[PDB]
């Protein structure tokens, strides 16, 4: 992680961790070309990759976030054949499935309604935002499902753990 | 009491518009101008509505708002009790007590999660976050008992049910 370490150091600043603002800046500087990451996205990335609960991303946490964005970008580029900077809503079903998320029709429509624009396309920022929320929601759940069957039984404090973790707070 | 309900009818008559019901934007207006920045955010008002919209209309009628108001009053009294230095904030130990004072029994993991989500970089909770946390806590307790139809204290969820909930309800 030669100058990856160095990129992290520049933006992280004095506390050596990355808050939402620093993440936007680094992400829009290095993943580049309207087509940029919003502060909404970067906050949900922090919220969901912040594994030690510090509230900001350290190097290790940032590096995992980064490998995730790249892999998701590969899938975007694969479906945006006509370089439009967007994929239509049908391709999103495919994208999500390719990235490992086998869902259902109710969920595919929720995703389209939430993340598609008025032409029914989905830009990269929305694309990444949606995948961040799916991975984050899946990992929150998975922590109670180490056996892997996709089914969990919860008591009330377990459900409060899950849900209070899942509900982001922005102010 | 009755007078406060009259007062509140008069606020609604002014800002609720024709439906006499308040959406999240309208609630924001009300709370931040029955007070005189800090103040409640849209995000928090969205959660207040999720909590107290007991008829599922998506907005608050007068009675639902009155109930909300009362809870905010009660929680505010708890907040005061701990913000002794008048700082507008309370610290993280103070939140555990405030939480327990408000009736919620939780555990150490929940205290860490509350801190991660509601505390600033100094590990203090401002009032917007305090109330926002409290309504979510109460809302989530209500969800649980509503999902637990047999009452055995346990709920079954699959990953898709979960992903379904987290995309609209949360
Ligand atoms: Ca920093
Ligand atoms: Ca961290
Ligand atoms: Ca395209
Ligand atoms: Ca299981
Ligand atoms: Ca209205
Ligand atoms: Ca209502
Ligand atoms: Ca204080
Ligand atoms: Ca049950």
What CATH number should be reported for the domain holding residue A17?
Answer: 1.10.238.10
Phi, psi of A14 (to 5 degrees): -60, -40
User: Distance of CA A144 to CAs A57, A158, B65, B163, Å?
Assistant: 24, 8, 37, 14
Answer whether A168's CB lies under 8 Å from A43's CB. yes
Phi, psi of A112 (to 5 degrees): -55, -50
Ligand at shortest distance from the CA of B94: 7
Give the closest of B112, B128, B155 to A159, CB-based.
B155
Q: Residues, chain B, total? A: 170
Q: What element of type H or E holds B89?
A: strand B89-91
Q: Cβ contact (<8 Å) for A50 and B116?
A: yes
Answer whether B118's CB lies under 8 Å from B89's CB. no
A20: left (phi over 0), alpha (psi -120 to 50) or beta: alpha
**Cα gap B2→B23, rounded to integer Å:** 24
Q: What element of type H or E holds B2?
A: helix B2-15
CB proximity list for B25: less than 8 A, separation 6 or greater: B42, B45
Method: X-ray
Please identify which residue in the block is written with the tokens 């969920």: A107
- As given in the structure block, the two tokens for residue A86 are 């967007």
CA B112 to ligand 2 centroid distance, Å: 13
Q: How deeply is A108 buried, as exposed, middle or buried, from its count of CB atoms within 10 A (0-12, 13-18, 19+)?
A: middle
CA B152 to ligand 4 centroid distance, Å: 19
Query: What's the start-to-end Cα distance of chain A, in Å?
Result: 34
DSSP-based three-state secondary structure for B109: helix
Answer whether B121's CB lies under 8 Å from B32's CB. no
Dmax over CA atoms of chain A, in Å, equals 49
Question: Is B161 known to sit in a ligand binding site?
Answer: no
Structural domain tally of chain B?
1
- As given in the structure block, the two tokens for residue B148 are 């637990």
**Cα gap B96→B112, rounded to integer Å:** 10
Is the CB of residue A96 less than 8 Å away from at least one CB of chain B? no
**Cα gap B52→A105, rounded to integer Å:** 30
Total H helices, total E strands in chain B: 8, 3
Q: How deeply is B129 buried, as exposed, middle or buried, from its count of CB atoms within 10 A (0-12, 13-18, 19+)?
A: buried
A56: left (phi over 0), alpha (psi -120 to 50) or beta: beta
Task: Give all strands (DSSP E) within A19-157, no chain letters.
Answer: 86-88, 121-123, 151-154
**Partners of residue A167 in chain B, C-beta under 8 Å:** 117, 136, 170
Q: Cβ contact (<8 Å) for B118 and A150?
A: no
**Cα gap B134→B79, rounded to integer Å:** 11
Phi, psi of B87 (to 5 degrees): -80, -10
**Partners of residue A153 in chain B, C-beta under 8 Å:** 154-156
User: Distance of CA A11 to CAs A8, A21, B62, Å?
Assistant: 6, 9, 49
Torsion angle of C-alpha atoms B114, B119, B121, B123, degrees rounded to 10 = -90
Give the closest of B153, B159, B166 to A166, CB-based.
B166
Question: Is A135 known to sit in a ligand binding site?
Answer: no
CB proximity list for A5: less than 8 A, separation 6 or greater: A59
Q: What element of type H or E holds A137?
A: helix A124-142
Task: Give me the domain span that covers residue B56.
Answer: 1-170
Which among A56, A17, A43, A64 is positioned nearest to A125, based on CA atoms? Answer: A43
């Amino acid at each position: 992680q030669q100058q990856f370490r160095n990129i992290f150091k520049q933006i992280a600043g004095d506390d050596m961790e990355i808050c939402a603002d620093e993440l936007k800046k680094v992400l829009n500087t290095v993943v580049n070309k309207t087509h940029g990451f919003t502060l909404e996205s970067c906050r949900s990335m922090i919220a969901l990759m912040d594994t030690d609960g510090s509230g900001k991303l350290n190097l290790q946490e940032f590096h995992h976030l980064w490998n995730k964005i790249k892999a998701w970008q590969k899938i975007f580029k694969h479906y945006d054949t006509d370089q439009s900077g967007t994929i239509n809503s049908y391709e999103m079903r495919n994208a999500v499935n390719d990235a490992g998320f086998h869902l259902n029709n109710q969920l595919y429509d929720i995703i389209t309604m939430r993340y598609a624009d008025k032409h029914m396309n989905i830009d990269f920022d929305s694309f990444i935002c949606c995948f961040v929320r799916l991975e984050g929601m899946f990992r929150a759940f998975h922590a109670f499902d180490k056996d892997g069957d996709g089914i969990i039984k919860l008591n009330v404090l377990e459900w409060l753990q899950l849900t209070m973790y899942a509900l982001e707070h922005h102010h």
